[PDB]
Amino acid sequence: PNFSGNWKIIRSENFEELLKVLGVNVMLRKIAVAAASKEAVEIKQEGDTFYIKVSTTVYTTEINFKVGEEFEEQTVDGRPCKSLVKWESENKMVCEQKLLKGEGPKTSWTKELTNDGELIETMTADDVVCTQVFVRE
Numbered sequence: 436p437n438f439s440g441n442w443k444i445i446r447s448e449n450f451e452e453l454l455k456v457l458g459v460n461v462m463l464r465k466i467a468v469a470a471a472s473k474e475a476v477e478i479k480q481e482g483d484t485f486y487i488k489v490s491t492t493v494y495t496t497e498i499n500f501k502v503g504e505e506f507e508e509q510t511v512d513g514r515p516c517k518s519l520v521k522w523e524s525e526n527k528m529v530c531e532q533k534l535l536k537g538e539g540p541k542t543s544w545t546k547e548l549t550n551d552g553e554l555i556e557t558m559t560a561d562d563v564v565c566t567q568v569f570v571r572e
């Protein structure tokens with residue numbers, strides 16, 4: 436696989452339900468769904484090392500990791516966490532997150548390159564899975 440690319444979102448599902456689990460109130464949920472509908476993801480993959488840039492209209496974040504090596508990022512609702520990415524197949528990876536402080540829902544994300552050329556990202560909190568689908572710009 437090669438995840439490298441400038442990816443633009445075409446579909447965004449269940450993001451409000453995810454934010455509901457994470458405690459966000461209704462109006463901020465609606466505004467965040469609108470922001471998530473503009474998500475863009477830039478990936479540079481060098482073997483098992485990933486440089487990712489995730490952005491919306493007013494915000495951008497850089498996430499750099501190596502498969503199998505712990506790193507620090509933040510959960511979807513913004514709490515710092517320790518993360519660990521593993522492959523689950525040739526074209527899909529899964530990240531488990533553990534909070535640095537306090538407690539919360541169990542959170543994770545996945546990234547998958549499909550045979551049709553799409554990038555599928557999911558974000559999970561407990562039983563609620565959000566699915567974002569992207570195509571190359």
Ligand SMILES: *C/C=C(C)/C=C/C=C(C)/C=C/C1=C(C)CCCC1(C)C
Pocket residue numbers: 467470471474476487489490491498510511512544545546556
């Ligand atoms: C490989 C892809 C990764 C690690 C994607 C991470 C995405 C996020 C942490 C999502 C952030 C968003 C919000 C919290 C609300 C506004 C829009 C998003 C989708 C950028």
